[PDB]
Amino acid sequence: GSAFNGKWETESQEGYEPFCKLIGIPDDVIAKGRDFKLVTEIVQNGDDFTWTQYYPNNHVVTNKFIVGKESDMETVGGKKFKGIVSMEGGKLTISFPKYQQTTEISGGKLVETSTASGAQGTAVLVRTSKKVLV
C-alpha cells in the first residue's frame, strides 16, 4: 500500500457545478447533490486497489483495479469499461470515458482532481477529503 487506506469524507470542493454541467449532469441532480459529502473507502494492497464511493440514495460505486494492468471498471453513471490505471510520484491517473481523474494523498488529505474538456473550455473539479476513521 498504503497511504490511501481508510475511510475519507469530502471536506472541500471546488468546480462542482461547472464540471458537472460540462460532463452532462442534469441541473436538478447538481442542485440536489451540492452539499452532499461523499465518503470514500479505499483498500490499497500495493498496486491492488479497491475503491468504494458512497453516493446518494445508497448508490455504491466500487472499482477494483491493479495499477499497470488492464482492469474491469465502472463509471459513476454505470458504464462498464476496461482501463489501465497509472501511478507517478504517488499520484494515480485514471482515464475515464468522460474525464481524466488524478488522485493523491497530499498533506494527509485525499485530493481528487477531475479534468474535463469541451467547447466552452476546460472544467476542473477538485475534491479534498479528510480521514473520518482515524
**Beta partners for residue 53, in sequence order:** 40, 61
Residue among 132, 127, 118 at smallest CA distance from 23: 118
Distance in angstroms (rounded) separating the CA atoms of residues 18 and 11? 19
| Assigned C-alpha cell, 81 | 469499461
How many domains are contained in the chain? 1
Distance in angstroms (rounded) separating the CA atoms of residues 44 and 41? 10
**Beta partners for residue 8, in sequence order:** 40, 131
| Assigned C-alpha cell, 87 | 501511478
Residue 16 annotated in ligand binding? no
**Under a CB-based contact definition with an 8 Å cutoff, are residues 81 and 88 in contact?**
no
Distance in angstroms (rounded) separating the CA atoms of residues 11 and 77? 23
Solving technique for this entry?
Answer: X-ray
Distance in angstroms (rounded) separating the CA atoms of residues 91 and 17? 24
**Under a CB-based contact definition with an 8 Å cutoff, are residues 114 and 124 in contact?**
yes
Residue 100 annotated in ligand binding? no
CATH code for the domain of 82:
2.40.128.20
Residue 53 annotated in ligand binding? yes
Residue 55 annotated in ligand binding? yes
How many separate helices (H) and strands (E) can be counted in the chain? 2, 11
SS (H, E, C) 42-102: EEEECCEEEEEEEECCCEEEEEEEECCCCEEEECCCCCEEEECCEEECCEEEEECCCCEEE
96 lies in which domain range?
1-134
